[model samples]
Target: GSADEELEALRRQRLAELQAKHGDPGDAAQQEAKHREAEMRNSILAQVLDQSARARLSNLALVKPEKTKAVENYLIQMARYGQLSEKVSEQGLIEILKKVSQQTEKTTTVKFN
Candidate 1:
């Protein structure tokens, strides 16, 4: 009983510390905005991506969250602005990823004798 109580006390203390550092739990309005943003992202992606493409994106998201986010936002913007006519297939997505990678790739020229 005493051990259980000690663990509970520690947990409560940690929670309190986190709350103090981060302020109170998120408010309803904040949660609503967050939910809405996620919904928008989902809806946009659904409109422009097939199942295989979405699955590939999900895997990319897991491996490279920042890069995935950049690509997601870029695609969503393109779709919203009437840039994408048809849904993107997995093959199409792969091409886009390659281009994105190339944009960030660096080349170095070495001095030759």
Candidate 2:
């Protein structure tokens, strides 16, 4: 019965090793999809933004990635609706950023009696 116990332990160890190796395929696929989506966004931004506007956005993204992503999505949506007739200028992009910032900010009013 000693050999039988040894065989069971060996099988269990092999099963765990196999599971570890196979467990990451789903995560890897998801990461690849996210990367591709970001690449598509970049391509759209290249077409929709002027050189200066794109430069400003790249800088903003370094400090505020979430805000930058929000702006990108908004711009893409606008483009989908045929709202963008020309490449967005830096000033125009700034206005959009300001609006996005306002949307995320909370307003509080104080009343004194």
Candidate 3:
């Protein structure tokens, strides 16, 4: 992106840092400081991801990690077999995440026990 786009992206993140997500969503290693992160505790992409998609992930895991992983993998397989869609471009998706992060003042789209 151009310099202007960079600055504008910062502008989008400002609200999120203020509201939450102040900590790094962190890297895979950081999230997986331990092995159990394989459960719903891991970052969004570690498993399947939803917009505000975590509690449901844990619920699935409760049924059994194998089952949860199986369903998630199946979704990936299905998407691979079909035309997956993204609502926005890279920058736009980042901006949307930031906005959702900000708006989740009282609650997080991502939930953890």
Candidate 4:
């Protein structure tokens, strides 16, 4: 009986630990840091964006985290001093996305998120 009770208590403690570990991302400070990061990301990315590009970036944000980050860094560099065109057309955006997406994946699948 003592062994059985101890095992059950251990199980309960383990379950509680799992729940706490797998819960939300973090507490208030970590959540605020995450929010600030997202704000800075948008501030950097908002440059040289059209309606279509904005929509595409929003959609890409869901499933393509690495690609989305790479694209954001690329755009920020381009916006700073790189010789990128100011007004990129929808076609131009697609072309760049496609070109880079190739090196990332052999078969690039663009989806609406």
Best model per lDDT: 2
Best-first order by lDDT: 2, 1, 4, 3
lDDT of each residue in 1-113, candidate 4, tens digit only: 59998889898988877765435666976987889987765664565777778788778888786777666665655566546557555676666677667454233544212
What is candidate 2's lDDT per residue for 26-85, written digit by digit as tens?
Answer: 788788888988877677778889899989999999998888877877777666657667
Residue 51 in model 3: shift from native, Å? Answer: 3.1
- TM-score (all chains, Cα) for each model: 0.60, 0.56, 0.30, 0.47
How good is model 3 by TM-score?
0.30
lDDT for model 2: 0.77
Off by over 4 Å in 4: 1-41, 82-85, 102-113
Cα deviation at 105, candidate 1, in Å, is 12
lDDT of 1 by residue, 1-113 (tens): 59998989999998877764335556866897799988987887888987888999999999987777667766776676776678899888877787776354222633111
Off by over 4 Å in 2: 1-36, 104-113
- Over the stretch 18-110, how does candidate 3's per-residue lDDT look in tens digits? 775436655854755555545533432333344434455466468656545544443444344343453223343334334444242224333
Q: Which candidate is the best by TM-score?
A: 1
Quote the positional error of residue 30 for candidate 4 in Å: 9.9
- Give the 10-residue window scoring lowest on summed lDDT in candidate 1: 104-113
Model 1, residue pairs in steric clash:
none
Name the lDDT value of residue 36 in candidate 2: 88
